[PDB]
Each structure stands twice: as structure tokens, then as C-alpha cells.
Paper text:
Isothermal titration calorimetry and enzyme kinetics show that there are two Tiers of targets, with CaV1.2 residue Ser1981 and Rad residues Ser25 and Ser272 forming tier one substrates for PKA. These share a common feature with two Arginine residues at specific positions that can anchor the peptide into the substrate binding cleft of PKA.
We also collected a dataset for PKAc in the presence of the Ser1718 peptide. This 2.75 Å dataset contains four PKAc molecules in the asymmetric unit referred to here as Apo/AMP-PNP PKAc, as it lacks density for the Ser1718 peptide. Three out of the four molecules in the asymmetric unit are in the apo state (chain C: ApoPKAc1, chain F: ApoPKAc2, and chain H: ApoPKAc3) and one is bound to AMP-PNP (chain D). Most notably the ApoPKAc2 molecule adopts a conformation distinct from the other two ApoPKAc molecules in the asymmetric unit. A DALI search of ApoPKAc2 yields top hits of some of our previously published PKAc:RyR2 ternary structures with RMSD values of 0.6 to 0.9 Å. This is expected, as the stable positioning of the loop is largely dependent on the presence of a bound nucleotide and can vary greatly in ApoPKAc structures. Nevertheless, the ApoPKAc2 molecule adopts a conformation that most closely resembles a substrate-bound state. This lends support to the conformational selection model as this conformation of PKAc appears to be thermodynamically stable and can be sampled both in the presence and absence of substrate.
Numbering used by the authors: 14 to 316, 330 to 350
């Protein structure tokens, strides 16, 4: 039954992957409530749809800055994935459009900050708290991997916690649709699987390694492999030696020993049973997988001069962002 749900999800994904939706709204259909922040390429604004009355978070990307910062491919790739995926723990892109100056990605409004900030505010998570979050990543990676997507950017900064207390994964610039191997070095060093560092090619198994690092940091308060210089972090990653805190349970240490396996042919999530080797592990014995997917489990923790948008008369970077 799980196999046929993924089969229907992949068919739906391939339809939108083949024919991405474009220009599903325009700028004059939204009321500009307030600017929530100014970012790398542009600003993020809280907006209200004039007709429906719902609230959305509109990201405005200056097309010229995107070109200068060499982020053209990452921007188009994120938009193509977001308009085609559909899963409870992924940020939902509601509308997208462009004009002469900017790109516009109208997102669902999610207040509640990133996991990185909360992790530094609390310190560390209790094992039941971490398991709640880890279970969501497991289902998310099961979904993305079934679409042949390697997320390969798992880190606390890319995990928001919504008002319901659930995880939403946000940054999809690096995500690549791969069936065989790939080689591009990307992602934060602390979460890189050893096969990435060795530059011998890698597949979806690097995501399960990243989950291993993520569970460790949540339960310990600090990542398993860390040093002042990246080259030292690389050595510790390839060496594989991990030290667990005393408060780590026996089940947790066993799961991490199988997720943080240096040999990708022995790593949990990359065996014949696939993701089920993780779901059926003793550490997740109390985990109701269907309930987590349905967002029924109670969350362990729940979280002015406005400037105008100038739309130039000249079309900017029309060639680069044609597919947006």
C-alpha cells in the first residue's frame, strides 16, 4: 500500500516536472502587508491575496543579483522542484511569476523560525523530541528519494518548525534528480558523507548519512564530527570513529552506528529493505509512522518605512530565466 501511494506520487510529480506551471499569479493581485526581511537576492514580504484573503510569504528575487552571485541554476532548479513536489513536510509554493526586474515565489506563510536557532536556544533535544523530528525527515527522504531526488543539503538551518510544531524543509537549490551517481561537492562539511569527500561519486545514501549526523546533533547538542578547519572535519568523517554521550540510549547508538556507516553498501537506508531498515529499528519502536504523516501526534514544542518594488521598463535577464 505504501508502494502504490509512492507510485501515484511519482506520476503526479513527473507531470509537473514535465510541464512546470508558470505565471500562476501577478503582482497586483496581492496586498503588501509588511516586509518580513531583506535577504541575499531581494526581500521577503507578508502578503494577502486580495480575493481569497489568505496570507502568504512572497519572496522577491532581483534577477540581476541572481546572475551576479552565480545562482541562476540553483534558483531555477528550486522553483522547478517546488512546483512539482507535494508532501506534508515540504514548504508549499503557492504561486510563482516574474516581471522585467524580479522573480516572485509566493510561499505558504510559516512562522516559527529555523531549527538551528532553536537548537542553540534550547541546547539539545530529548530523545523523544528528536525522534519526532527524525521521523519526519525519514518520511520526507522516502518521498524525495522515490522521485529520484538527492536532497544533499540536510542541516538544521534548512529545517523550519511551524506553529503546529512540525518540520518543513526549505532549501532545494542543491537537490538533484539522480538515478546513478553524481560528483558535485556541495553542502556543509559537518554533514558531508565520506563518499562525497573522497570524490569517488555518490548516490541517495548521502542523505541517510546526513540524517545520522542530524540525529546525533539533536540528541547531543553538537555534531559528531567537528573541528576548526574543514580539512580536519573531513579526516574525522572518513575515519568514521564516533564517540557517543553517556546519556545516549542503546537503541540510539545502534541506529547511529548504522546510519553513520562509512561503507555506503552497509549504511541503513541503502540496503535491500531500503527505508524500512530505519522504520523498523528499535529506536523508532514507539513511532506511529502513519500518525506522523497525518500530523496527528502532538508537537513537543510550539514556537517601519516600507519601500516600493521598482519594476524597470527594460526586461532584465530575460534569456537566463526563461523557464521560470
Amino acid at each position: 500500500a505504501v508502494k502504490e501511494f509512492l507510485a501515484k506520487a511519482k506520476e503526479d510529480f513527473l507531470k509537473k516536472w514535465e510541464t512546470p506551471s508558470q505565471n500562476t499569479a501577478q503582482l497586483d493581485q496581492f496586498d503588501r502587508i509588511k516586509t518580513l526581511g531583506t535577504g541575499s537576492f531581494g526581500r521577503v514580504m507578508l502578503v494577502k491575496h486580495k480575493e481569497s484573503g489568505n496570507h502568504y510569504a512572497m519572496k522577491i528575487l532581483d534577477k540581476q543579483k541572481v546572475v551576479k552571485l552565480k545562482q541562476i541554476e540553483h534558483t531555477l532548479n528550486e522553483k522547478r522542484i517546488l512546483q512539482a513536489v507535494n508532501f506534508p513536510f515540504l514548504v508549499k509554493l503557492e504561486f510563482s511569476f516574474k516581471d522585467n526586474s524580479n522573480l516572485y515565489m509566493v510561499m505558504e506563510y510559516v512562522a516559527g523560525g529555523e531549527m538551528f536557532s532553536h537548537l542553540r536556544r534550547i541546547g539539545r533535544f530529548s530523545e523523544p523530541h528528536a525522534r519526532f523530528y527524525a521521523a519526519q525527515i525519514v518520511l520526507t527522504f522516502e518521498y524525495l528519494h522515490s522521485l529520484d531526488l538527492i536532497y544533499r543539503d540536510l542541516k538544521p538551518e534548512n529545517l523550519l518548525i511551524d506553529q503546529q510544531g512540525y518540520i518543513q524543509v526549505t532549501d532545494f537549490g542543491f537537490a538533484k534528480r539522480v538515478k546513478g551517481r553524481t560528483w558535485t561537492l556541495c553542502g556543509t562539511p559537518e554533514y558531508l558523507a565520506p563518499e562525497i569527500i573522497l570524490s569517488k561519486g555518490y548516490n541517495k545514501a548521502v542523505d541517510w548519512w546526513a540524517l545520522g549526523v542530524l540525529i546525533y546533533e539533536m540528541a547531543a547538542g553538537y555534531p559528531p564530527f567537528f573541528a576548526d578547519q574543514p580539512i580536519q572535519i573531513y579526516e574525522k568523517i572518513v575515519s568514521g570513529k564516533v564517540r557517543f554521550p553517556s546519556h545516549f540510549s542503546s537503541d540510539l547508538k545502534d541506529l547511529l552506528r548504522n546510519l553513520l556507516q562509512v561503507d555506503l553498501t552497509k549504511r541503513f537506508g541503502n540496503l535491500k529493505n531500503g527505508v524500512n531498515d530505519i522504520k523498523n529499528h528499535k529506536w523508532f519502536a514507539t513511532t506511529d509512522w502513519i500518525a506522523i504523516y497525518q500530523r496527528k501526534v502532538e508537537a513537543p514544542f510550539i514556537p517601519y518605512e516600507e519601500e516600493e518594488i521598482r519594476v524597470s521598463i527594460n526586461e532584465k535577464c530575460g534569456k537566463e530565466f526563461t523557464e521560470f
